[PDB]
Amino acid sequence: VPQELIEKIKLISPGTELRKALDDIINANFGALIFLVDDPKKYEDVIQGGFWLDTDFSAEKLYELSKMDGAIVLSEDITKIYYANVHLVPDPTIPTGETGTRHRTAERLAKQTGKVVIAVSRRRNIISLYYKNYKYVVNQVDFLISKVTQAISTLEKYKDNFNKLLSELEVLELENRVTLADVVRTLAKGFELLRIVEEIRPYIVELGEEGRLARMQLRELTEDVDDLLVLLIMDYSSEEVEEETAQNILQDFITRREPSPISISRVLGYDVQQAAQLDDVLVSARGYRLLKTVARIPLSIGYNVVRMFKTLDQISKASVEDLKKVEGIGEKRARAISESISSLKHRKT
Amino acid sequence: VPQELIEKIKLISPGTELRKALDDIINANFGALIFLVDDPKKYEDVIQGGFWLDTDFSAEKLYELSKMDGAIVLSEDITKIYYANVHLVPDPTIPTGETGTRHRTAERLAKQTGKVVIAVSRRRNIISLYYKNYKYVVNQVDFLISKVTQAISTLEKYKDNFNKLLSELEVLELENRVTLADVVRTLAKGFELLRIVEEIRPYIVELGEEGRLARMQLRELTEDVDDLLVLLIMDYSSEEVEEETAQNILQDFITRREPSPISISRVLGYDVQQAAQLDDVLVSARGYRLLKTVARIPLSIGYNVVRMFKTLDQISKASVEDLKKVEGIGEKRARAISESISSLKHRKT
Amino acid sequence: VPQELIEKIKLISPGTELRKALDDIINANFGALIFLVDDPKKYEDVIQGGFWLDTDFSAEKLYELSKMDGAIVLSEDITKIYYANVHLVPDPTIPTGETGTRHRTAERLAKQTGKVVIAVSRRRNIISLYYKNYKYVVNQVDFLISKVTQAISTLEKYKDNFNKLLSELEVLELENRVTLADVVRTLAKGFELLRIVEEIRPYIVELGEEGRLARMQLRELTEDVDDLLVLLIMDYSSEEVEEETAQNILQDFITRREPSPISISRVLGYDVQQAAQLDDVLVSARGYRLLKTVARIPLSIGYNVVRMFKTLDQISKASVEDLKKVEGIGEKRARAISESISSLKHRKT
Amino acid sequence: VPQELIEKIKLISPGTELRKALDDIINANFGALIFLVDDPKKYEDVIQGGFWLDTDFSAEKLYELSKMDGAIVLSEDITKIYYANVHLVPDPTIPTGETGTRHRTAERLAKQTGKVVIAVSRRRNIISLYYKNYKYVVNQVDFLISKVTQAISTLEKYKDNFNKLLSELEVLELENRVTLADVVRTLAKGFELLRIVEEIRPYIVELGEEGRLARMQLRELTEDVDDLLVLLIMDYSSEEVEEETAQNILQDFITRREPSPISISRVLGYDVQQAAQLDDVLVSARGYRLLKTVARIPLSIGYNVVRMFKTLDQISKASVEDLKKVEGIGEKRARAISESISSLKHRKT
Ligand SMILES: Nc1ncnc2c1ncn2[C@@H]1O[C@H](COP(=O)(O)OP(=O)(O)OP(=O)(O)O)C[C@H]1O
Ligand SMILES: Nc1ncnc2c1ncn2[C@@H]1O[C@H](COP(=O)(O)OP(=O)(O)OP(=O)(O)O)C[C@H]1O
Ligand SMILES: Nc1ncnc2c1ncn2[C@@H]1O[C@H](COP(=O)(O)OP(=O)(O)OP(=O)(O)O)C[C@H]1O
Ligand SMILES: Nc1ncnc2c1ncn2[C@@H]1O[C@H](COP(=O)(O)OP(=O)(O)OP(=O)(O)O)C[C@H]1O
Ligand SMILES: [Mn+2]
Ligand SMILES: [Mn+2]
Ligand SMILES: [Mn+2]
Ligand SMILES: [Mn+2]
Ligand SMILES: [Mn+2]
Ligand SMILES: [Mn+2]
Ligand SMILES: [Mn+2]
Ligand SMILES: [Mn+2]
């Protein structure tokens, strides 16, 4: 959905005064045909008849004018009502796929002028927005809230399985018993999860002001996932990988590529043909995830620990004296690495 | 619900253009009577009057034609509108249980021709689909979404109790303190759970495109349960059982047989009359569940470990050298069995 | 809500054919006035005019007859339609609190005959059931489903806090560090929980067939709670208490008495004036809860263990030989008591 | 929303008989204009024509009178209907922002008299309440229930993250490895959580009687949070802080101040410029949270333990003899402190 159209869709989002008027018009089964332009003079030839009003906008005024036939002309910022009861006369030779004089007029006019034209069906109670060559049909709020609500429920289900997967991976990681299968399974869930969020965004956008709580739920559910998936990729790819590379991998499996177990294993740099092979490939975490999330060591300084110790297994065997010999690790950070790794080993294994 | 009818029901599932038209017709309290045939000529004798249109289908065109009396004739793939305003004249001596000329016409016509006939009640806003001798009344989406939503909530409740049961069984299993009561209680919950999924399927099917999120939730909630129930049956039945036998047992208690504690105990091969006996029967897990799910040992090679060691208790006491003597266990799989069983014992008991 | 009335309310519960007809009547804003009697002859004097039909009942027939003025007379089992378009003439000197000739007629007639009379308001879309001296207004399903859904959500919240309370009490119980405050807090949550279930029952009953999933959720959420509360009462009351006594205590705090911390402490047999005292009273569990739920020892035989050992603390210190000396404890049950108590101590403390 | 207006809003809250009448009026698309006064005589000059009724109030009577034009005059306690079909004539020179004679009349009249005037739009089905200079538009219940339901869902999400944060802080606290970052992160979640509750209150208030379950859910979800946040503030602020000071801090970050990590750190008395510094500041809990919540030591006597031992770390190293030397600690409370701290250390670390 192009950005220029998304902006127009916001004009009639729940919570706007225009939307309140359109909902009132629908509730009384008036129809409407609304032309949005900034200079009525430029459009003098497609606007005929009716009444020149040049008055300030309000939902009640729009409502009252929709009792009459014809079309209503508004300023584009929805602050002025210019015309009511007009006859719109766009070029008849412009192709239209609509049935019905009001909807056909609406499409032809939107195409001809590059402006927004809103049609409200009198007895079907549908709001159709036309802009340039686009047609957006407006969903009612209950439909949107239903979709969004179901989507969040689904995310809860995915997030639960993701946490369960990850907590099992933690154990394996602390005991150095991790296979590629374990990692790829965890990454796949994270990707699928973030995918759901992606597909639900346009519903949440269209909710406008009524989608605030939805956004907060989405945020509490998923905010820390992407950080985690990136660190998992830095911990388990075939060879050393910049955070940026890892973020790119993430972006791709969200959007362009399908998170199949083989696909992920191969993008991770492992030469696997068939999925049952993943059970057989042994891997060790580099240690970035634990270093950043638990030892609170910045990634930049984390590169050094990993450069020197190679694996988390080796980091966990290091004394505090051994750790200080890393460029950027003093007694404070050395203690943090040391103590938090042992605390996790004691408590989790 | 026969498969041939299920296909017809899909024609008017949420998300189809036909359904959008029927919903628009309902919203304006037009009625409708729609005859679906592939060759209008074959049916020249039940179709009378009206207008021959032979035009391409669309929701708006269907809407507009439903403003007129009589019936509308569509091609079966819903790509052509053949007729509007026709008088349908099926054989009057065909039995009908309907009241009202439009619904009676609809049933008689469906029976006589073997085709689909849709009746939309003008003021009751009901969509009735007739096909051959079947009558499907269409549920509105909000009703379906409500059912499906409640059903998923119920499944969450069952799934929680199932996980709690199973985690307690794990402890008992690791300490070799399992009674038949413990197993049968766990199996019963799993069966009841999978049963709910079965009963909710036709609701999710009828949702068509609007049931995508529901399907994903059902899948995240239950996908791994059946695997688990099968492995539990292989672990605790009276004598050795093929995976296929176990899958059959599962299928039955989902569908044909009621998962009573005594029923399950007896199908599991234990001679029990009254339920309080189950507390007294001591059992040991063969070890398949832990071998496949935790040691990632394929069932085929699992048969061998179990053939040699009989119980999970014995498998847990085996050294890594002892395990290698099993046909299909090398140092890698022997270590995995060994290490994962001890890790679970350390952490869970 | 008296039982005789509850039975009448079931006649128009969601899922009944009568209810389907009433919903169709409401959807078209017909009104209705329906008299339910088993012998029309007995009532010949309150039934005037209209048409004698003596025909089989169906929703469509009822619908069609509600298009006409007056009242419809049905058999009480809703299998026969006796009359349509009748003028009901109950004794005018019977007091009525209703406004409107149809509702006033309905109440007076219900009172005079002891039968059911249903009034459906033509433009308010309300279903009023009158029986003897009762008036039940029917809730629409969406309203009921909303209440029930909210109630289950609330129960989830209570149940979570109950589990958290109880798991903390388990720790204290295994370490013999339990105060009366800890117990009373746990009991209070359980009582409040079971109370919610009580208040939501009439909503679930009125849902009829559409309340099946609700019932299953209520059952999965709460089924084991009452058993547990009873065992807690047997474990912590001032002196020894029969299971029946404990069940009675439970019943009371659900229904008749308000579960205040002081109230519960005193019904439990502890002489406490002010709530902060509860922090100071040390108590020990008798051991019944752990004996029945974990050792799977029947209450009858549990009385003996407790008679001999007094507290769970003492039971946990007993050898297996010491336990066998209890009437009803052999080597099997002695091992179960012994082993499960130590397993819990190892894992939970 | 001023308190005097909130009281007026309660008059038409779900569950009131007035609200039931207004809903019936809306369902039939009658309009209404209702004037609430205690002495009709005082208002003889703005009330013209119509019928003097001086009769008792009921929803059905109000309904029936709304079938006629004009306005209805009620007593302020909604027990009397004084007038129907009257012509209200407030001073025309009073400014109004409304369109439409009924709404304009309503606002002008409310302003002129200081009384409540309710307007019900005939075809838009909106209830507008005017009182003095205020205008409250009434939300329909389904809209409110939707908001409230979404808000509780959101709170569940926040509460889950809060518990997870706090349980991790517990571990760090028991091992004396707490940074300011850990605390501030936990406080921020608690503040955001309590904030959501604050913003949702007016929705729950407007639900009136239909918001009972919502209130119970809000209460089960959040009741113990504020106590906990206060104790965290007493445990981690720069220097010693009275409970009252801490409660004040809480109140502020709920309402007046935005819970940014730097803002909280500084109000806590730590001189931090940029957020990454918080990772580097080491802190120790004073011990109040554990003393009150786990040792059940009253705050007053807690001041003394902390005065003598300074940190929880030191309290955990104290013998039972050492503890008794605190003013207000006898053998009972000394044992409780001692034993519960070690039980937590054993089980959590
Ligand atoms: N060129 C036009 N200019 C201004 N108003 C128009 C124009 N064409 C149609 N309308 C307005 O639309 C109104 C309905 O016309 P109609 O033929 O029913 O179209 P429609 O596409 O079927 O719309 P509905 O779905 O019925 O609301 C009539 C008129 O007030
Ligand atoms: N044989 C028929 N062929 C074509 N159209 C028919 C036929 N019978 C009825 N209709 C159409 O149905 C319309 C309504 O007839 P009606 O007697 O009210 O039946 P119905 O079963 O009660 O349907 P409604 O529930 O009112 O919509 C009238 C006519 O336009
Ligand atoms: N004694 C009666 N016997 C049979 N039908 C009656 C009787 N009284 C009223 N009705 C039926 O009720 C219909 C509506 O009467 P009405 O005065 O509007 O009562 P009501 O209580 O206001 O009902 P509504 O709320 O309008 O449906 C008229 C008539 O068909
Ligand atoms: N001063 C008034 N006194 C009593 N009743 C009034 C008064 N002004 C309007 N009404 C009542 O309101 C009714 C509708 O008038 P109207 O001009 O449509 O106002 P409105 O603000 O548009 O209300 P609606 O939104 O249509 O319900 C007519 C009359 O019965
Ligand atoms: Mn006209
Ligand atoms: Mn993030
Ligand atoms: Mn006709
Ligand atoms: Mn499966
Ligand atoms: Mn009449
Ligand atoms: Mn029970
Ligand atoms: Mn008039
Ligand atoms: Mn509190």
Q: What DSSP string describes D113-171?
A: HS-EEEEE-TTT--EEEEETTEEEEPPPHHHHHHHHHHHHHHHHHHHHHHHHHHHHHHH
Ligand 4 pocket test, candidate residues D47, D102, D127, most atoms within 8 A of CB: D102
Residue A239 and residue A317 in one domain: no
Do D316 and D294 touch, CB atoms closer than 8 A? no
| C27/B150 CB distance under 8 A | no
Which residues have C-beta within 8 Å of that of residue C348, sequence separation ≥ 6? C170, C171, C174, D347
Burial bucket for residue B244 (CB in 10 Å: 0-12, 13-18, 19+): exposed
Strand-strand pairing, A71-74 and A32-36: parallel
Distance CA B113, CA A235 (A): 66
- And the tokens for D68? 């006629």
Which residue's alpha carbon is at the smallest distance from atom 22 of ligand 2? B100
**CB-based touch A/B (3+ pairs, under 8 A):** yes
Ligand 2 neighbour B124 (Cβ under 6 A): yes
Count of residues making up chain C: 349
CATH classification at residue D338: 1.10.150.20
Q: Which helix (H) or strand (E) holds D300?
A: helix D299-309
Subunits with 3+ Cβ pairs within 8 Å of C are B, D
Judgement on whether residues D27 and D9 belong to the same structural domain of the protein: yes
In angstroms, the CA D301 to CA D296 distance is 10
Among A82, A112, A138, the domain boundary falls at A138
Spatial neighbors of A248 by CB under 8 A, at least 6 apart, are none
DSSP H or E stretch at residue A128: strand A127-131
* B63-to-A100, A318, B16, B23, B70 alpha-carbon distances in Å: 11, 76, 14, 9, 13
CB of residue D144 inside a 6 A radius of ligand 4: no
This structure was determined by X-ray
> Which chain D residues are closer than 8 Å to C126 by Cβ?
24
Ligand nearest to the CA of C218: 10
CATH number assigned to the domain comprising residue A95: 3.40.1700.10
What is the distance in A from the centroid of ligand 5 to the CA of A139?
A: 29
D212 lines ligand 4 (CB under 6 A): no
**What are the two backbone dihedrals, phi and then psi, of residue C89, each rounded to the nearest 5 degrees?**
-130, 65
Flag if D124 and A28 touch (Cβ within 8 Å): yes
List the single residue in C100, C154, C171 with the smallest CB-CB distance to D216: C154
Residue D128 and residue D158 in one domain: no
**Closest-CA residue in chain D for C122?**
D28
Give, as one character, the DSSP assignment of residue D68.
S
Q: Do B220 and A171 touch (CB under 8 A)?
A: no
**C157:D214 CB<8 A:** no
Shortest distance, CA D10 to any CA of chain A (angstroms): 24
Neighbours of A195 (CB within 10 A): 16
Q: Are A195 and A237 in contact (CB under 8 A)?
A: no
Domain termination residue (choose one: B75, B108, B138): B138
Give the residue from chain D lying closest to C349, CA to CA.
D347
Task: Write b or e for each residue in C35-74: b if 16 or more Cβ atoms lie within 10 A of its Cβ, otherwise e.
Answer: bbbeebeebeebbeebeebeeebbbbbbbebbeeebbbbb
Name which of D244, D246, D241 is nearest D230 in CA terms. D246
How far, in Å, from the CA of A136 to the mean position of ligand 1? 18
Together in a domain, B131 and B171: no
Please identify every residue whose CB atom is under 5 Å from ligand 6, which is an ion: A 223, 226-227
Whether A25 and A59 share a structural domain: yes
Resolution of the structure in the document, Å = 2.5
With a 6 A CB cut-off, is A31 part of the ligand 1 pocket? Answer: yes
Q: Which residues of D touch C179 (CB under 8 A)?
A: 296
Which stretches of chain B sit within 8 Å of chain C by CB? Answer: 98-100, 103, 123-126, 146-147, 150-151, 153-154, 157-158, 160-161, 171, 175, 177, 179, 181, 196, 279-280, 348-349
Per DSSP, D35 falls in state: E
Residue A10, judged by CB atoms within 10 A of its CB (0-12, 13-18, 19+), counts as middle
| Contact between D58 and C153 using a beta-carbon 8 Å cutoff | no
Question: Ligand 1 in contact with A50 (CB < 6 A)?
Answer: no
> Is the CB of residue A105 less than 8 Å from the CB of residue A69?
no
Distance D120 CA to ligand 4 centre (A): 9
Distance CA C14, CA C145 (A): 11
CATH code where residue D163 lies? 1.20.1260.110
Q: Which neighbouring-strand residues pair with A81? A: A55, A74
CB pair distance less than 8 Å for C152 and B151: no
D23 and D69: one domain? yes
Closest residue by Cα to residue C283 from C340, C241, C242, C236: C236
B128 bridge partner residues? B119, B137
Q: Strand, coil or helix: what is D53?
A: strand
Chosen for mutation from A146, A173, A182, A221 (greatest number of chain B CBs closer than 10 Å) is: A146
Do B176 and B313 form a contact (C-beta atoms < 8 A)? yes
Please write down the HEC assignment for all residues of chain B: CCHHHHHHHHCCCCCCHHHHHHHHHHHCCCCEEEEECCCHHHHCCCEEEEEEEEEECCHHHHHHHCCCCCEEEECCCCCEEEEEEEEECCCCCCCCCCCCHHHHHHHHHHHHHCCEEEEECCCCCCEEEEECCEEEECCCHHHHHHHHHHHHHHHHHHHHHHHHHHHHHHHHHHCCCEEHHHHHHHHHHHHHHHHHHHHHHHHHHHCHHHHHHHHHHHHHHHCCHHHHHHHHHHHHCCCCCCHHHHHHHHHHHHCCCCCCHHHHHHHCCCCCCCHHHHHCCEECCCCHHHHHHCCCCCHHHHHHHHHHHCCHHHHHHCCHHHHHCCCCCCHHHHHHHHHHHHHHHHHHC
E strand segments, chain C: 32-36, 47-56, 71-74, 80-88, 116-120, 127-131, 134-137, 178-179, 282-283
Structural domain ending residue among the three candidates A138, A172, A188: A138
C-beta separation of C113 from C166 below 8 A: no
With beta carbons less than 8 A apart as the criterion, state whether A12 and A210 touch: no
Q: What are the chain C neighbours of B348 within 8 Å (beta carbons)? A: 347
- Please indicate, yes or no, whether residues D23 and D144 belong to a single structural domain of this protein: no
Spacing, Cα A226 to ligand 6 middle (Å): 5
Long-range CB contact pairs, D311-314, < 8 A, 24+? D311/D176, D311/D284, D311/D285, D311/D286, D311/D287, D312/D173, D312/D176, D312/D235, D312/D284, D312/D285, D312/D286, D312/D287, D312/D341, D313/D176, D313/D284
Contact of B228 with B166, CB cutoff 8 Å: yes
SS3 per-residue string spanning C122-159: CCCCCEEEEECCEEEECCCHHHHHHHHHHHHHHHHHHH
Which positions in chain B touch C220 (Cβ < 8 Å)?
Answer: 154, 157-158, 160-161
Q: Answer whether A85 contacts ligand 1 (Cβ < 6 A).
A: no
Does one domain contain both A212 and A236? yes
Provide the shortest C-alpha distance from residue D292 to chain C (in Å): 11
CB atoms < 10 A from the CB of D265, how many? Answer: 23
Whether D102 and D64 have beta carbons less than 8 Å apart is answered as no
Residues in chain B, overall count = 349
- Report the SS3 class of residue A100: coil
- Atom 29 of ligand 1 has which residue's CA nearest to it? A70
Q: Is the Cβ pair D296, C146 closer than 8 Å?
A: no
Q: With CA atoms as reference, report the closest residue to A60 among D135, D103, D29.
A: D103
How far is the C-alpha of B205 from the C-alpha of B3, rounded, in Å? 12
Domain that holds residue D202: 139-286
Are the beta carbons of C276 and C326 closer than 8 angstroms?
no
Residues of D in contact with A145 (CB under 8 A): 146, 150
Whether D158 sits inside 8 A of A346 (CB atoms) is: no
Decide if D181 and A296 are in contact by the 8 Å CB cutoff: yes
* C175 vs D contacts (CB less than 8 Å): 339, 343
Is there a single domain that holds both residue B274 and residue B294?
Answer: no
The reply to whether C254 and C149 lie within a common domain is: yes
- D27 vs C contacts (CB less than 8 Å): 123-125
The answer on B163 and B282 residing in a single domain is yes
Q: How many domains does chain D have?
A: 3
> A67 CB less than 6 Å from ligand 1?
no
State CA C44 to chain mean position distance.
41
Q: Which helix (H) or strand (E) holds A208?
A: none
Nearest to C32 by CA among C84, C96, C89: C84
Residue C162 near residue C176 (C-beta atoms within 8 A): no
Q: What distance in Å separates the CA atoms of residue D54 and residue A328, rounded to the nearest whole number?
A: 87
**Tokens at D242, concatenated:** 């009275």
Q: Rounded to an integer, what distance in angstroms lies between the CA atom of residue D68 and that of residue A272?
A: 81
| Cβ proximity of B178 and B349 under 8 Å | no
Is there a contact between C11 and C64 (Cβ–Cβ < 8 Å)?
no
Claim to verify: residue C155 and residue C270 sit in the same structural domain: yes
CA distance readout (Å), B109 to A300, C118, C238 = 76, 37, 78
Report helix, strand and coil shares of chain D as percent, to nearest 5. 60, 15, 30
Q: What distance in Å separates the CA atoms of residue C241 and residue C112, rounded to the nearest whole number?
A: 52
